[PDB]
Symmetry: D2
Subunit: 257 residues, 4 copies
Amino acid sequence: MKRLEGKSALITGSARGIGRAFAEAYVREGATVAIADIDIERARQAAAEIGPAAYAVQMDVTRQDSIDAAIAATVEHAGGLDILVNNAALFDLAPIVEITRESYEKLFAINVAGTLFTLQAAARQMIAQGRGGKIINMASQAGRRGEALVAIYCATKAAVISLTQSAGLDLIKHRINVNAIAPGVVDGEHWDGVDALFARYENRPRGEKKRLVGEAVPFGRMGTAEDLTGMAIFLASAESDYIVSQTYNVDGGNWMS
Amino acid sequence: MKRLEGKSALITGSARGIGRAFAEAYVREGATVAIADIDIERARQAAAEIGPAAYAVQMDVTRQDSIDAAIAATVEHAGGLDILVNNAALFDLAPIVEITRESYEKLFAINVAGTLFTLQAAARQMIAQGRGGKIINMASQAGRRGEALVAIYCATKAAVISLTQSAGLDLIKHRINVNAIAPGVVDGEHWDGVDALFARYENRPRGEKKRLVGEAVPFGRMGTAEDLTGMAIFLASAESDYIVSQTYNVDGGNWMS
Amino acid sequence: KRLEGKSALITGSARGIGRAFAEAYVREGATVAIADIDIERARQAAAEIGPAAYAVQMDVTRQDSIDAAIAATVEHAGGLDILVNNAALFDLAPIVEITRESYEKLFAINVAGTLFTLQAAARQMIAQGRGGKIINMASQAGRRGEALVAIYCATKAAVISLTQSAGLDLIKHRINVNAIAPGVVDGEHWDGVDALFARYENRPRGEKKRLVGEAVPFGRMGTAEDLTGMAIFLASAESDYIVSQTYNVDGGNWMS
Amino acid sequence: KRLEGKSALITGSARGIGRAFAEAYVREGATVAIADIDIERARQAAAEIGPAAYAVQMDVTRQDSIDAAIAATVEHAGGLDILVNNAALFDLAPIVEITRESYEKLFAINVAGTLFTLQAAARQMIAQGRGGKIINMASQAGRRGEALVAIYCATKAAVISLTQSAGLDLIKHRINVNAIAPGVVDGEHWDGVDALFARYENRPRGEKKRLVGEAVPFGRMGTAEDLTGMAIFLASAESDYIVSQTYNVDGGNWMS
Ligand SMILES: OC[C@@H](O)[C@@H](O)[C@H](O)[C@@H](O)CO
Ligand SMILES: OC[C@@H](O)[C@@H](O)[C@H](O)[C@@H](O)CO
Ligand SMILES: OC[C@@H](O)[C@@H](O)[C@H](O)[C@@H](O)CO
Ligand SMILES: OC[C@@H](O)[C@@H](O)[C@H](O)[C@@H](O)CO
């Protein structure tokens, strides 16, 4: 297809799961992809498995110096930055009266501050190049509507949707598209962990939550990262140039926006 | 690219404007396209200009017998129906105290009933075939939020978003995706009419509303049909198979959903 | 009290939520036209509520009936201050079994009935020059679609849209247009809802009613008395700055 | 009247909307903690409002301050029945000029402030076993993003989210969690808003205020008094079935 031919992308948290499937689909479409992760060991493996057009970048989105160095590493390696995917995220679950300041601080630091300050750094580079840009934030059904036990993670994803809108309005004058994707329930490592938290607080065998949520998807199954790669390419591609400040649910019907 | 290779499409209201641009893009992507319009003269012209893979069908979405004969024509000519685009619509504007029963009956008959009952006829054919299906309703910024002067057209597109959600949840068991596109302000014959209506009721020179509205788009310009064709292909394509009951704004940031 | 000396009309207020609203308005000092297509049931409702209530035959699907009800409100009460568009009809059916009969029946009363009654009440409130309160009945069903409930969800989605458009156009005349979206409310309406779901989801009668009442975050099926606070609030001076809103009163069933 | 014998705490209630809420709650028979980082301004507001109002020094960004403020409410009034999370901070800046300082400042007060005061009040209401009312202050800014207001929009979007999550999780304790979304409201707050826009949009001081007031469908900038109705309603028995909602009180500025 080669919809992203000769673009330079960076994907946060892309050593594994959705981010890694995005990095693989972007390379197939002709992009050069910085596989950015706090796990540089795993990012190096993913990059070697994907091919020459992927390369590994150590990044902690909670740290300005680390954000700024991955953008620099992208510029130094790929000549610049065309596509940012804000994919780095942390999940946690607790009822209101058991939420910790540590839970709040760590999920806001990566899900909100990590997304905003990486977007800022990417937009400054895209503006300095003068060629436009594509920024794709990762939201979630969790950001469409609250849940009794997931206040913190829901709020971070609600903040990401709002940030997507703000930044898209502020950056479209530079021909930077900011938009977001809102997955449903996606099978993998991520949803294994989610399931363990619900197992504890809803008093359920390990694996039952993840079975039930997958069966309640109107489409009829839990998501895969491959359900999402179409939209990831589309929102990075010329065919989305008029799309601004949107969150698109790709969730088998889990949330209707 | 040929992402709709060997597919059979029908687009209501496609002799001109957005639907004609969709029929043109679908053909480029390998589709066979029923150019359905109440205006057979213009459909025939549009099909001749697009090429052999387009073919004209006389249709009034307000009439059951016409709906069912357009679906049959599609099966007779293309062997079946894979993609419906519900594009046929009617625009009107009047303050609350000036809305006529005639404005309401005619815009609900085309924009709502035409959409629902064509969707119904296409869903039955797609179920009969057993191969799944793609249905794309045309909503509007006007369906996201009301306007003092556009209560009827706004309500119809609000009903389309709702219908899109309902039909999506009901039809996805048959592997029929129902989604919608929500354009912003799009340049052409359509918006010339809109402008004439505002000119009268906001007491403005012809062309001033079109100017102002195109200049208030955060993207920075009035839409084109070409802005939309990417989304039209995508939502008809295998890369949108997990997308269900969504309305996607392609509007240069005019409305943020 | 809070509606002292105000003239209301409620469409479809012989029975259920509409009737709870008429009674609650009369307790707050309002005169209320109990507008219903069944004049027998309206008359009973009016006798039970007391002298401040009166019965008005009305078919919100007929222009002539609309204009005659508004006129009858003017004749009896001197004018119209509050309209509640409560008249509605429920139906259910999968996409492939939806009939033009259902579509035309639910649209004529839930949408056209709301719109043209609102138009008539607007015209009257504009001519009086004293402003006004209009309250459309939306539903959780207007907030999101449902596989089986396409037609009824669409009508209530259109009511939320209309409520927005009308509130924007009419606020210059000091007329507030807003809507209430109930969730799952116990009564003769949800007896009918349950019966349809019983057929289409293969359930014993009463099970849907039970399941949805228990899924309400608050912990039960709603009552009309849950809604009276808001219907008073939105027709009162304490909501003068409130324009073009739909407010969910639904135990958390839908979060807007 | 409607809040007779209830104990309220309002964060950041020495001045503006919070202070109008305090006075309106005392008029409706409430005892009110005027909680504010500025104890001198709180003392003045308390003295002006009358004996039912008392001042509490409170930094909603500090856990110890939050807990001591809840404890001062229990000591002074005997319990806590109504929290209003009103304390908030405005800032404006384009994406490329957002500081970590702004992000950290606005989230600490607008989000963490709201969340951990809500948690502290929840714990106290649960231990009491008598239910309660929590009202978060959202904003039109919470409803949609703006080019120059990413941080403040994001905080109020998180307040809407938190309001939904908290309301769902606390309704079993008969605690209602709801929010109010003002639009553009006149006062010291919008003075500061206008000053920031004057810089970034290159406008004379006061112009932004003028433009936004005039673009409210209703026809003017809002007052605190536009909001007291709803603040009372959401703390009252006639909102007991109202759960996890954000209600716009904004003259039509934003339609939800
Ligand atoms: O990725 C987050 C996950 O999808 C989850 O938060 C769901 O919203 C919810 O927690 C239960 O189904
Ligand atoms: O095609 C619909 C059209 O975009 C128009 O209705 C705008 O919503 C509005 O009328 C004001 O610009
Ligand atoms: O008054 C409408 C009613 O509450 C219903 O349509 C529900 O939305 C749903 O159909 C089943 O729970
Ligand atoms: O207090 C929030 C305020 O109303 C402001 O943020 C407006 O939303 C907007 O920023 C300018 O009109």
